Ligand binder design. Structure first.
Ligand SMILES: Nc1ncnc2c1ncn2[C@@H]1O[C@H](COP(=O)(O)OP(=O)(O)OP(O)(O)=S)[C@@H](O)[C@H]1O
Lengths: 240, 129, 226, 238, 236, 123, 239, 227, 96
């Protein structure tokens, strides 16, 4: 209301309204949470079918950036695809220049600088994405990071991105997060996603769960969720 | 007035035509036809007419024919019709202040420039050919 | 912005930069018979600041002094440019650069920044001096690219008042010490009441070379000089 | 509404309306329908003309030996992405000496159309791609959008009044998966005969069908191997 | 329905600035040109001598080759640029093709340069209109005119500048199908038909399709005006 | 109304910056030259005649440009340094190219083309 | 005033520009406090953390960024500008080490960072990196140093130094405290830093919120204190 | 809408719709495909007696069997004609054969709507293309937007509505040549304003057995006097 | 009960135009050998009264020159007037 056009200009009270408007763009996006255990990091995304036109296995927001790192994006999908390609490129340069796996702090700092560089100038807009970054290493343990649309990148035990950002972490934080291995945390994330928004505004949603840790020996892939089928036989027991 | 002229108790053959000077500030309740049909404007006269109204007005004085009407005509190329009259009358006044029969060019210059204030037609443009 | 003239007047963005110069810290500089005296007015905001870190009086070569009245952050930039340029002259000609050639090239740089249309002008007015070929000089520049030549001048707050004192006080013939005396007089006319060995900062230019005085001799001299 | 002019500007509700306007520019194309079986993928479009005497503007165009696209919207961007498509096909056909999988090609299409949707100085592409192909795992029916959010389906339909087509696809998407080519194609035109107002009927010269098969090369048909496809119908239930 | 610039169409399908850069041509000095069958002739009016300078540098008629001649209207600086580039272009045509330069080629060049100058981003259109007269192929006289749009447009006689409708109306009312004597007298009648015809502001130059440019002398033109006045008396 | 930049034309059509550069000429120092054979002269008015200058320059408006040419100046001062250096460099490049002094009219048209290059372009 | 709506970096009438003096409170949107003190042959940084979450970590909330092995810093303001400024500082210190063969003095580094911010200010079409930076380091023949770098490109450096949100009050306490001529025997420095932050913020809190970065002329390496010795200093000033 | 790089809320071309509007002011032209061959006609709209009629170009020669007609703006047509001439010669270079008319017009509409000022404006001309490929005669019509289509008998420019209507009245598929010629000039002297004579219009007919000289020169007088 | 159809109309393209042309033509002494579609193309955008004004100007010519069956040349001059000399003033020519 006065000056919020360019991404270079300041306000009479000193903040950039472009960055705020891009931050609350992801607020309308789907709910995506993440949490780590003592030997791994678990992702989970509330994903919704439009009406009946999807195929249940298209456009998966669970990407796979490096051999041990993947994203859990939410927001504008194509911008997240481009950012995932940039992250693949950065891990490519590191693997080509130093001969070992990228530490997640350095990767997150390069990605944060790339996002900040798209927030700086006036020709371009800030990104409309907010994503998660998990990892595991034998000499480092489990690491879960978090990048906002502005470019502030730091670490968590658990997080949530979407509508129910507070309404997930209200009952995320009552989890005994340290003493659990991630194979419990699979159905834990299942119940957390299943709590929020069963039928209220939309009609139907669908669950994806990504999975990295010591049990994959350092690999990162989606769970065989059909194996052990841990949502629904507990989701039907989570309504009471 | 409107109900009288071109409305009720209509024309028949009653020629009451309304000419003006502007085009803008009027109520369009009569811009629509019927009330008044045709419209005409007026530019300022051209060189062919400039020399014409010159000889019309410069005739009122024993012209010092060495003065260049065409210089006045092209310099004062936007003579609506008042400058011509006023200019020639005041040129005669300038001259006959000295009781001269002819009117040297300088008297015409003074007459016109008194008549023609605030006139700067040079660049622009002013800066061409 | 900077690409188009006014209906009748001048370059408003250069006039505003000149106003920002006139709203700056005061200074005074006097050309005498044998040397040139520069003097600034450097007040710390608090009692916390150190007086050995930032320097107003700054040499360009061993015999060329230079002060300003404006913004240090642009001052240092065009100082560094003048450094590199003077060393390029000394590369080309193997001879220390004359002050007129310095003022030409620095004025060319400032003029190039006054050209269109995305960069702002400097908010810096210089006072350049040096002792080239016996006769010393004094050259003031401005953000507009222009330059002048002074016998004694001032820039900053109350430069008009200090200049009317300079017209009355100064003359044609003095020595460097009497120049420093009248310079601290005309700077003390307009500065605050507490003037110490650190609130001022003075460099001179003898024919033997530039000399940037110390707080020892500055405190010795301005210990109630008159 | 004074923020609603360029691609760069985020809205105060976060919805960049240039993307919405490009979507609405896609909504004014011709109707077209693409749907696949387990072994054969068929996309069928609708032709139009400028006048009676002139020929019809074509929609199904060839790309590669196993790739063919439908289209809706602009035609300069259509041929631009066509040339880029053929170029990236013959690039990998040169280098790897294999046919391309479809998914990486459409990812390259999204990465191609990403740049004109984020920087300043290019417009988003008004484009209506319906892509049929063959990787090792059978037919694929993808669709694009000017927002580059490409979708995979089993049967889609884009263009003007294409929603009744979608209702038909809803009530026969279970039936689609089993059948061979002929009744599959006539399900496609039993979507196209509802993409039309009821007072006129689909003739020969205005319809186009392109089949790609697991052993069959991509081939376009026009009126003459379509006269076999147009018989085997009844009237609409008036 | 805005204002700037030369890239936007009107709401009813016009370009305002081509028509508006034609106005500077429409309000400039007059210059006419006709072709005879063997000798071509043209000339400018409004010498406009300010009593105290030289005028050999302000010449509005120049040449690019030994076969072709120039004229213009509008503003003179754009004429200076176009003539400078045109000399270069005529010489570059002489570089490859070994002919004397055809008039149609150099007019296509002028119109093409003018239009690709007008199409581009924010370049002000050349507000001139040239007359390009020459006779090369079997000594065939040609004269073409230009436009700020860039439309070369071949005529047989021409009138531009201030009040060009009246001047072209006289060539309309003269122009007979039925000899360099009638062409000289036709130039005399055209310059007598000028907007002022002061008798001393007349500047004319001719070419007899084998020669070079000939600048006349304002005593020969005085006898031309005298025989025009004699024929005007013989009309009565 | 149709102000914004040096380009494009006004609706009659005239120019904006040309007349306004002329009106930027009008408030400056006065120069002249005189009609003389076997010699020619220049006159100039001193701007800023204040008593605390130096006058050590011998020339504030005159610029002896080649050997047998000088030039006065009027207008905005610091554009003229850019112009005088470039003009000297043009004439000196001519002398380098031919080893004959510059016959002054192609010098004048060179500077006019330099100025006209900023009259046409934008912005 | 404006009027001109101060959208780009130009000069307004009488006489300032508003972009940089809007950037001077981009620090103030950080919600954070920093204090530096130089008394003697040591130098102390102190800065608190605002972590409301138990799900959030504690190691990676660190604002003390070890620039080189003898130079530390702390940041306030928004985080992205701060971290990018820190990597520019590290890159340019490494450039010094490559070009000139020895360890960079802390003065030239602040000059180079200020010049980068001025170039970001001089040319438009870039945001002027709204974060403030305080540096510390030991130099031979000069002792310890404390410097401050502005977003405008105005470096300075001085004895008792503070920037953030509430540092008019901090400099008021440091004028009311650095006026008595006692020496500063390193626990005098730690005690005055803890108590100056404890009087400005008035919290008197656990040893787990503030971060303490020190450097001393006995071990010129930059050093971040541990919870045990932070607790030791806090109860050592507890009377 | 101001600008070639902004869509509409609905479905407006703007930078192109105003070009399609700018077509309509130009002079008319009529080309008719017949299996015997393609005929073509145009109106010059001669203003002056000094306006020399053979210098106004409407029908130019691209190939030995490929003709053309232009519309509206003159110089965009000059650009496209120049490039079209250059590229057919390139085709003859690398293929020893004639670039067919569909390939010609695709080669033109590769950049007929490719207007970009950064990374210039859209063109203001409608074109009518006739030629004889291996499939016999062809008649082709493009637009500024590159939306190129085949047309059997297309009319452009001014008064094209009644031209199309009265053209669809008389035309069918099995017409002859001369019947189509006089049917065209009937439509012409119903849509022109001046008296039809030797200097107003010009024809261009191409036959497979008469590939050379796609023109009629003052036997056109004999054609007009037969009405 | 009050107003229940909500019809609307605006400028007809040429057909209602041509019809009104003929209407006002037979409404006065005109030449039958004239056409309208030609004149219709001339008519860019106008109300019937404007068109009626074209008819009036044709009458003005037929008052100047002794015309009975107002010819399409009388109407040609009338069109010159209405659509060029009355399109707004005269400001079209001098560029083809
Ligand atoms: N559609 C039409 N059919 C027949 N005559 C028409 C038509 N439109 C206009 N005219 C004639 O042109 C003249 C225009 O008059 P009106 O149409 O009443 O003016 P108007 O200003 O449109 O009236 P309003 O404001 O809609 S009540 C009439 O005298 C009609 O004879």
């Amino acid at each position: 209301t006065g000056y919020d056009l360019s991404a270079s200009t300041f306000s009479p009270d000193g903040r950039v309204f472009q960055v705020e408007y891009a931050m609350k763009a992801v607020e309308n996006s789907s709910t995506a949470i993440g949490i780590r255990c003592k030997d791994g990091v678990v992702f989970g995304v509330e994903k919704l079918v439009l009406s009946k036109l999807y195929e249940e296995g298209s456009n998966k927001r669970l990407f796979n950036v490096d051999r041990h790192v993947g994203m859990a994006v939410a927001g504008l999908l194509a911008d997240a695809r481009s950012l995932a390609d940039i992250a693949r490129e950065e891990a490519s340069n590191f693997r080509s220049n130093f001969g070992y796996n990228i530490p997640l702090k350095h990767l997150a700092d390069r990605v944060a600088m790339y996002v900040h560089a798209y927030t700086l100038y006036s020709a371009v807009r800030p990104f409309g994405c907010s994503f998660m970054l998990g990892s595991y290493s034998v000499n480092d343990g489990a690491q879960l990071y978090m990048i906002d649309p502005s470019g502030v990148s730091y670490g968590y035990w658990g997080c949530a991105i979407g509508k129910a950002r507070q309404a997930a972490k209200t009952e995320i934080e009552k989890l005994q997060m340290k003493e659990m291995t991630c194979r419990d945390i699979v159905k834990e994330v299942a119940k957390i996603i299943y709590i929020v928004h069963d039928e209220v505004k939309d009609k139907a949603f669908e669950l994806e769960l990504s999975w990295v840790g010591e049990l994959t020996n350092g690999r990162h892939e989606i769970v065989p969720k059909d194996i052990r089928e841990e949502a629904e036989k507990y989701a039907k027991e989570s309504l009471k | 007035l409107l109900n009288q002229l071109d409305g009720f108790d209509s024309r028949g053959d009653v020629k009451v035509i309304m000419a003006t000077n502007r085009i803008e500030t009027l109520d369009p309740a009569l811009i629509r036809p019927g009330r008044i049909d045709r419209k005409i404007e007026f530019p300022l006269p051209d060189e062919k007419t400039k020399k014409r109204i010159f000889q019309i007005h410069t005739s009122r004085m024993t012209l010092a024919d060495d003065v260049t009407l065409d210089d006045l005509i092209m310099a004062k190329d936007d003579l609506s019709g008042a400058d011509i009259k006023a200019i020639c009358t005041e040129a005669g006044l300038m001259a006959l202040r000295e009781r001269r029969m002819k009117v040297t060019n300088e008297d015409f210059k003074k007459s016109k420039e008194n008549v023609l204030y605030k006139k700067q037609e040079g660049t622009p443009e002013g800066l061409y050919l | 912005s900077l690409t188009t003239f006014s209906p009748s007047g001048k370059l408003v963005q250069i006039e505003y930069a000149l106003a920002a110069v006139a709203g700056g810290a005061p200074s005074v500089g006097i050309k005498a018979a044998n040397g040139v005296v520069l003097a600034t007015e450097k007040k710390q905001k608090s009692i916390l600041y150190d007086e050995r870190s930032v320097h107003k009086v700054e040499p360009i070569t061993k015999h060329i002094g230079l002060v300003y009245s404006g913004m240090g952050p642009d001052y240092r930039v065009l100082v560094h440019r003048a450094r590199k340029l003077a060393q390029q002259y000394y590369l080309v000609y193997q001879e220390p650069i004359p002050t007129a050639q310095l003022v030409q090239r620095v004025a060319s740089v400032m003029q190039e920044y006054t050209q269109s249309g995305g960069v702002r002008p400097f908010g810096v007015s210089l006072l350049i001096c040096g002792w080239n070929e016996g006769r010393p000089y004094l050259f003031q520049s401005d953000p507009s690219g222009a330059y002048f030549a002074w016998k004694a001048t001032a820039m900053g707050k109350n430069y008009v008042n200090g200049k009317t004192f300079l017209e009355k006080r100064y003359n044609e013939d003095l020595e460097l010490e009497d120049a420093i005396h009248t310079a601290i007089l005309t700077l003390k006319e307009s500065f605050e009441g507490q003037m110490t060995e650190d609130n001022i900062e003075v460099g001179i230019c003898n024919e033997a070379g530039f000399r940037r005085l110390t707080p020892t001799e500055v405190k010795d001299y301005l210990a109630a000089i008159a | 509404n004074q923020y609603d002019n360029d691609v760069t500007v985020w809205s105060p509700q976060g919805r960049i309306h240039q993307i919405e306007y490009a979507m609405e520019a896609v909504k004014q194309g011709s109707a077209t329908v693409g749907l696949k079986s387990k072994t054969h993928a068929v996309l069928v479009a609708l032709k139009r003309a400028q006048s009676e005497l002139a020929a019809h503007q074509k929609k199904i165009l060839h790309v590669d030996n196993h790739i063919g696209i439908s289209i809706a919207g602009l035609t300069a961007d259509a041929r631009l992405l066509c040339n880029f498509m053929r170029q990236e096909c013959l690039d990998s056909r040169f280098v790897f000496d294999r046919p391309l999988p479809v998914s990486r090609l459409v990812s390259l299409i999204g990465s191609k159309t990403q740049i004109p949707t984020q920087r300043y100085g290019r417009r988003p592409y008004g484009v209506g791609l319906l892509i049929a192909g063959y990787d090792d795992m059978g037919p694929h029916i993808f669709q694009t959008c000017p927002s580059a959010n490409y979708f995979d389906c089993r049967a889609m339909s884009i263009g003007a009044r294409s929603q009744s087509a979608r209702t038909y696809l809803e009530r026969h998407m279970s039936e689609f998966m089993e059948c061979n080519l002929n009744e599959l194609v006539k399900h496609g035109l039993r979507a196209l005969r509802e993409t039309l107002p009821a007072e006129q009927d689909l003739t020969t010269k205005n319809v186009s069908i392109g089949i790609v098969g697991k052993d069959l090369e991509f081939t376009i048909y026009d009126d003459d191997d379509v006269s076999p496809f147009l018989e085997g119908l009844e009237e609409r239930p008036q | 329905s805005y204002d700037r610039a030369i890239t936007v169409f009107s709401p009813d399908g016009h370009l305002f600035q081509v028509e508006y850069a034609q106005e500077a041509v429409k309000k400039g000095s007059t210059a006419v040109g006709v072709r005879g069958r063997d000798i071509v002739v043209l000339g400018v009016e409004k010498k406009s001598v300010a009593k105290l300078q030289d005028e050999r540098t302000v010449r509005k008629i120049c040449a690019l080759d030994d076969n072709v001649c120039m004229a213009f209207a509008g503003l003179t600086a754009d004429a200076r640029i176009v003539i400078n580039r045109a000399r270069v272009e005529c010489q570059s045509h002489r570089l490859t093709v070994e002919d004397p330069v055809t008039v149609e080629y150099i007019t296509r060049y002028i119109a093409s340069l003018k239009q690709r100058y007008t199409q581009s981003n924010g370049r002000r259109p050349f507000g001139i209109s040239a007359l390009i007269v020459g006779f090369d192929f079997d000594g065939t006289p040609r004269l073409y005119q230009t436009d700020p749009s860039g439309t070369y447009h071949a005529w047989k006689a021409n009138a531009i500048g201030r009040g060009a409708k009246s001047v072209r109306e006289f060539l309309e009312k003269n122009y007979t199908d039925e000899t360099d004597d009638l062409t000289i007298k036709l130039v005399i009648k055209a310059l007598l038909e000028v907007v002022q015809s002061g008798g001393k502001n007349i500047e004319l130059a001719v070419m007899r399709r084998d020669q070079s440019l000939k600048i006349l002398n304002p005593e020969e033109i005085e006898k031309y005006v005298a025989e025009i006045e004699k024929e005007k008396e013989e009309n009565e | 109304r149709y102000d914004s930049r040096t380009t494009i034309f006004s609706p009659e059509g005239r120019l904006y910056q040309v007349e306004y550069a002329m009106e930027a000429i009008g408030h400056a120092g006065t120069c002249l030259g005189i009609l003389a054979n076997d010699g020619v002269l220049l006159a100039a008015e001193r701007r800023n005649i204040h008593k605390l200058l130096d006058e050590v320059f011998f020339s504030e408006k005159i610029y002896k440009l080649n050997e047998d040419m000088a030039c006065s100046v009027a207008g905005i001062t610091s554009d003229a340094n850019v112009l005088t250096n470039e003009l000297r460099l043009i004439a000196q490049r001519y002398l380098l190219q031919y080893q004959e002094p510059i016959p002054c009219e192609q010098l004048v048209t060179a500077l006019c083309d330099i100025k006209q290059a900023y009259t046409q372009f934008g912005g | 005033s404006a009027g001109f709506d101060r959208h780009i970096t130009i000069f307004s009438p009488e006489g300032r520009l508003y972009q940089v003096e809007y950037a001077f409170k981009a620090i103030n949107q950080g919600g954070l406090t920093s204090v530096a003190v130089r008394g003697k042959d040591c130098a102390v940084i102190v800065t608190q953390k605002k972590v409301p979450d138990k799900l959030l970590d504690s190691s990676t909330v660190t604002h003390l960024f070890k620039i080189t092995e003898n130079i530390g810093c702390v940041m306030t303001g928004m985080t992205a500008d701060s971290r990018s400024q820190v990597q520019r500082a590290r890159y340019e210190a490494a450039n010094w080490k490559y070009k000139y063969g020895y360890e960079i003095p802390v003065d030239m580094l602040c000059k180079r960072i200020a010049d980068i911010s001025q170039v970001y200010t001089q040319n438009a079409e870039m945001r002027p990196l709204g974060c403030c930076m305080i540096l510390i380091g030991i130099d031979e023949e000069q002792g310890p140093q404390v410097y401050k770098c502005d977003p405008a490109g105005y470096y300075c450096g001085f004895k008792a130094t503070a920037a953030g949100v509430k540092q008019t009050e901090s400099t008021s306490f440091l004028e009311k405290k650095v006026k008595k001529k006692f020496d500063w025997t390193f626990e005098q420095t730690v005690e005055t830093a803890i108590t100056c932050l404890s009087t400005v913020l008035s919290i008197d809190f656990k040893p787990s919120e503030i971060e303490v970065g020190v450097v001393t002329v006995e071990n010129p390496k930059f050093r971040i204190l541990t919870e045990a010795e932070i607790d030791a200093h806090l109860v050592a000033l507890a009377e | 809408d101001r600008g070639v790089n902004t869509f509409s809320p609905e479905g407006r071309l703007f930078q192109v719709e105003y070009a399609i509007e700018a077509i309509k002011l130009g002079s008319t032209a009529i080309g008719i495909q017949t299996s015997e061959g393609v005929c073509l006609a145009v109106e010059k709209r001669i203003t002056s007696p000094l306006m020399e009629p053979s210098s106004i170009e409407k029908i130019v020669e691209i190939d030995a069997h490929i003709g053309c007609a232009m519309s509206g703006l003159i110089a965009d047509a000059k650009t496209l004609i120049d490039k079209a001439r250059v590229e057919t010669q390139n085709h003859w270079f690398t293929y020893n054969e004639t670039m067919t008319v569909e390939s010609v017009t695709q080669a033109v509409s590769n950049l007929a709507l490719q207007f970009g000022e950064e990374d210039s404006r859209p063109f203001g001309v409608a074109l009518l293309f006739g030629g004889v490929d291996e499939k016999g005669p062809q008649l082709f019509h493009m637009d500024p937007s590159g939306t190129f289509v085949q047309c059997d008998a297309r009319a452009i420019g001014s008064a094209s509505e009644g031209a199309q209507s009265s053209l669809q009245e008389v035309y069918h598929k099995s017409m002859t040549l001369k019947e189509a010629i006089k049917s065209s000039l009937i439509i012409l002297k119903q849509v022109m304003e001046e008296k039809l004579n030797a200097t107003n219009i010009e024809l261009a007919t191409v036959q497979p057995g008469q590939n050379f000289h796609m023109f009629t020169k003052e036997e056109l007088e004999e054609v007009i006097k037969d009405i | 009960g009050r107003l229940d159809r909500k019809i609307e109309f605006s400028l007809p393209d040429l057909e209602g135009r041509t019809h009104i042309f003929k209407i006002h033509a037979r409404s006065m002494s005109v030449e039958r050998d004239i056409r309208f579609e030609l004149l219709a193309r001339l008519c860019p955008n106008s109300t019937g009264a404007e068109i009626r004004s074209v008819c009036t100007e044709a009458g003005m010519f037929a008052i100047r020159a002794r015309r009975k069956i107002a010819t399409e040349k009388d109407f040609l001059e009338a069109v010159n007037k209405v659509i060029k000399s009355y399109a707004k003033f005269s400001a079209t020519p001098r560029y083809m």
